[PDB]
């Protein structure tokens, strides 16, 4: 059992917001993040609805996935997780402009894989999978978390015409862009400048990333893969354990 005792865990400075909770930096036993959910007298049916959250995070142990570390129910509902020294991946291509060589970008994208095959082998969909999830820690490990971002939004879920839009294929998708980004430094949609046309056109089928606007050195293999995961017809897409061994493939090449 994984519930934190009262009065353990010191909460600092917030550092913002995502799809679900608000993040601080807190302590408890070094360093620690803390998600409080700001639930206020907890209800039964919350209660249980929280529990079925920390029990889906909890049956995840891995390098390459934000680490679960607790939970409180007292004085707030929140989630301890490991802390991340560092930022993020988008921040290091759109914000810092970090001159990674292309060994570090396959690296990158070889540990998102690895993540994200571990997520789907225990049959955890992220569901909006993005470069702003993919902390790098240390500037070295991909952390992959947190379960106005329709750039990685595959076409089937910006219909939402489904009963179930979510899927391993539209988090395969997802990791497509994650990819287009590595590869070009550069958001997808460069000089499409409204984003009701963007979303239009994709759930319609008649935008995909421009792929020649990858990086010269940018590998075949590569090339290839990307445009595997960015297909129109979710079935058509690679699952992660082949993502994973083209990559792997590609990473010794390199
Ligand atoms: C800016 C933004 C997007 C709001 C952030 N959220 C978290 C954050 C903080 C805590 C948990 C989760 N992710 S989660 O809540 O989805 C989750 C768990 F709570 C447990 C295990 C995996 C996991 F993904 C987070 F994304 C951030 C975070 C996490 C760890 N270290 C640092 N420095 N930041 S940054």
Redesign the pocket.
Same mark, same amino acid.
């Given at each position: 059992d994984w519930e934190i005792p009262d009065g353990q865990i010191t909460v600092g400075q917030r550092? +913002? /917001? +995502?799809?679900? +909770? !608000? @993040?601080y930096?807190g302590k408890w036993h070094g360093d620690v993040? @803390? #998600?409080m959910l700001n639930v206020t007298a907890p209800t039964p049916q919350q209660l249980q609805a929280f529990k079925n959250?920390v029990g889906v $995070?909890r049956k !995840?142990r891995h390098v390459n996935? $934000? $680490?679960?570390?607790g939970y409180s129910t007292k004085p707030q509902l929140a989630?301890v997780?490991?802390?991340?020294? &560092?930022? /993020?991946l988008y921040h290091h291509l759109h914000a810092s402009e970090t001159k990674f060589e292309m060994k570090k970008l396959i690296d990158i994208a070889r540990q998102t894989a690895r993540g994200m095959d571990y997520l789907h082998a225990k049959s955890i969909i992220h569901r909006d999978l993005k470069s %702003? %999830?993919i902390?790098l820690?240390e500037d070295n490990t991909v #952390?992959? &978390?947190?379960?106005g971002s329709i750039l990685w939004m595959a076409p089937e879920v910006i219909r939402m015409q489904d009963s179930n839009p979510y899927s391993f294929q539209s988090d395969v998708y997802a990791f497509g862009i994650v990819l287009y980004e590595l590869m070009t430094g550069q958001l997808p949609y460069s000089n499409i400048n409204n984003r009701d046309q963007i979303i239009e056109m994709v759930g319609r089928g008649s935008l995909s990333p421009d792929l020649s606007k990858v990086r010269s050195n940018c590998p075949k293999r590569m090339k290839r893969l990307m445009a595997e995961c960015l297909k129109k017809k979710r079935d058509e897409r690679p699952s992660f354990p082949r993502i994973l061994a083209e990559i792997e493939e590609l990473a010794r090449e390199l």
């Open positions: 550092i +913002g /917001s +995502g799809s679900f +909770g !608000t @993040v930096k993040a @803390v #998600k959250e $995070l !995840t996935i $934000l $680490l679960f570390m989630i997780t490991q802390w991340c020294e &560092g930022s /993020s %702003n %999830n902390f820690h #952390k992959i &978390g947190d379960f």
